[PDB]
Amino acid sequence: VSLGHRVRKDFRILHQEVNGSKLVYLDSAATSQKPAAVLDALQNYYEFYNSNVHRGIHYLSAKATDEFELARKKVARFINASDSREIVFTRNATEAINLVAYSWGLSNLKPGDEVILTVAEHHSCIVPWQIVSQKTGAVLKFVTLNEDEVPDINKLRELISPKTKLVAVHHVSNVLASSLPIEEIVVWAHDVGAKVLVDACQSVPHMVVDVQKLNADFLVASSHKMCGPTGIGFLYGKSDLLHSMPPFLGGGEMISDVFLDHSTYAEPPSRFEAGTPAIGEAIALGAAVDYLSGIGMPKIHEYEVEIGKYLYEKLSSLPDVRIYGPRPSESVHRGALCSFNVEGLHPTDLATFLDQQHGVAIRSGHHSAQPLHRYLGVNASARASLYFYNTKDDVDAFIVALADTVSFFNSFK
Amino acid sequence: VSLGHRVRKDFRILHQEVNGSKLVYLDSAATSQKPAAVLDALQNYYEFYNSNVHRGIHYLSAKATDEFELARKKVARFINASDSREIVFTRNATEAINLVAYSWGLSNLKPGDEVILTVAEHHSCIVPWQIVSQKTGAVLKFVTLNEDEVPDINKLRELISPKTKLVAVHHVSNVLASSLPIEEIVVWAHDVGAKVLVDACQSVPHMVVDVQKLNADFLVASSHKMCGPTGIGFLYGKSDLLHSMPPFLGGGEMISDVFLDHSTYAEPPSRFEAGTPAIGEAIALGAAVDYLSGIGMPKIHEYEVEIGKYLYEKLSSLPDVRIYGPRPSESVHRGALCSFNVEGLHPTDLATFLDQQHGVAIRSGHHSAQPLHRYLGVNASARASLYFYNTKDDVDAFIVALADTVSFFNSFK
């Protein structure tokens, strides 16, 4: 029994019919589905010990606070943070990136300072640093792709100079499925005195992530892509860096004392957590971490390797299909997703027909990476993305359905 | 059978023993408990149609998107917004206040501009404006209390001058249980060109709220206090005002087009909703709105006035008890909470004993209203706070338990 066929039972949502067909869900890169264990944890919180956290004294509040802070610890060890106080809870990675931009960026960046991105960056890792640029006078340096449709590592290294103060790049690309050598990027950046923000949204759900091994200064991720609930995500930041940073959001809970004239602030991470947090959601994210850890991130990543290659191979075997990004090898690792287009056909037509006639769920669009599509020469692409609850059977059904969809639209010549 | 005894069945969490005693929950001002209907809607989302929202072609996405946006309309209807596009989803009211402070505040407040608050303001409606003041040179004008321990409405009106640009005050106080004449205050502020932000966290869950009648410019509230999940809250704002406002958080979903050099932004409310939102939590908040509406907010308000009055009377019948805020009368109405202290005893001792020996859950501290307690001459107070699932029997148990607690600690003096 493959991993997918073993865990499929845990995910109630996959066991239904859509538009007359068995659902085939291949959009996990937009968001993941949740196992019973996570939903149980969420229900058990609300039904048995919901109360506001910290300084609540009474039994339910003490239990709520315990589990809440315990979930912070679970996330901390998942990414191997040295200290749980280096984990700050946000709504999503987007907010987490904004926290760094507002609190650290507006506080450390001067006119002339350089921030390095790639053209394959997600919008949440472009727009905040655009606004920081417009406020501070800092300049954005973009790393174009090479012949293998991945960010050019020597071009990136060339861009690292004493003017560089920040490198904000993806660990894994949500479109190209390519990875960056973060650990060595961090060394080159640190040699110059620059900080590295890692957009780890597509790596944390799918492979082992070690922030100490990476030595990254900031790392961001979203719960909803890693079998956890919507409405929570997290920011990792080195303790020393967080202690240096001013508050982002202000108000209740993040303060030490409040006077009419001024207020004093708590230390991280409470400094950056203003008002009542996503308590039940944090606790269920903890459960998602327990669930993923129970399977084993090595087991998951190795499985995604096999089904990802299988998806790449079968998709690429169709004529007129172009898959963006690198070709799989033992030197080039790919995430378990393919962004593609079919000659003469619009990806929205593909996605629509796949869903309506075959119950297959993919997405069409720029996938929040419009500049990348521009550099590739298109406005949109189709994307099939897997998680460990997908199977080879899912890929086969998708390929059959896609071949039928292509045949349909081409029949009109 | 009273409303409380009618609906208690809906709330699983109330039916348990803590510390050997039947639970008596009197901490709803800190957070509320959730009816089965809300939890079911949350579970139903995750088990059956979880998918990312907007521009998603496939069946599950279309359904999630429809329910997500329907939930936005349910919230707009609940507070009688004229347009659902005037509702912006946040993590909590604190964030919503921060949105206004950052987006509207920093781009409209100049050195010398005045912001009017009261000394009874919640920390989330104090600290963001302190920070804005520090950044723009604006100044805060605080309204003190009168002999009835409510904000001096005379001193408030007199503070209104051509220098005031914003009045940011509570609708109902989370400590005093008093209310402010918001509708009138809006008229006075608008006559000098000032905006009004209503902190409606203690009004939205407990009574009919009509933003068009109030004619408020901004209004904020948190889901977790109104039978909804943690992790979501909202900002209401007039469409013209929201349209004039620059983005707060930047990234995916809030954009129109993203280029390497700059980005354009969507219109409200998408403009202010960056990255994947708390999709499931928003849907559940809509279910909470459906639930509260099914009971009836006038019926809820009527019931809280009765049990709130009952609580005040019983508590004030105990010797050496002082309740902060105004006395209940035919002209002056209190919310269903009492913040208090007992002569010679610390409120933390009261709360701890009540929980451990009697299973009674209340709160001790400054309840994120520190300048208010300072003003009143104390560092902290005890607070018992009710919702419509509380009964007179709960109040009787509390008073019995409190009398015993007072007896215990005074037995050593």
Swiss-Prot record, chains A, B:
It holds the Pfam family Aminotran_5. The cysteine desulfurase activity is stimulated over 40-fold upon complex formation with SUFE1. NFS2-overexpressing transgenic plants have enhanced ability to tolerate and accumulate Se and may be used in phytoremediation. Changing residue 338 to S: Total loss of the Cys desulfurase activity, but only 20% decrease of the SeCys lyase activity. GO terms for molecular function: cysteine desulfurase activity; pyridoxal phosphate binding; selenocysteine lyase activity. Ubiquitous. This is Cysteine desulfurase 1, chloroplastic. It comes from the Eukaryota. The modification N6-(pyridoxal phosphate)lysine is found at residue 225. The lineage of its organism: Eukaryota, Viridiplantae, Streptophyta, Embryophyta, Tracheophyta. It is found in: Plastid, Chloroplast; Plastid, Chloroplast stroma. The keyword Chloroplast applies.
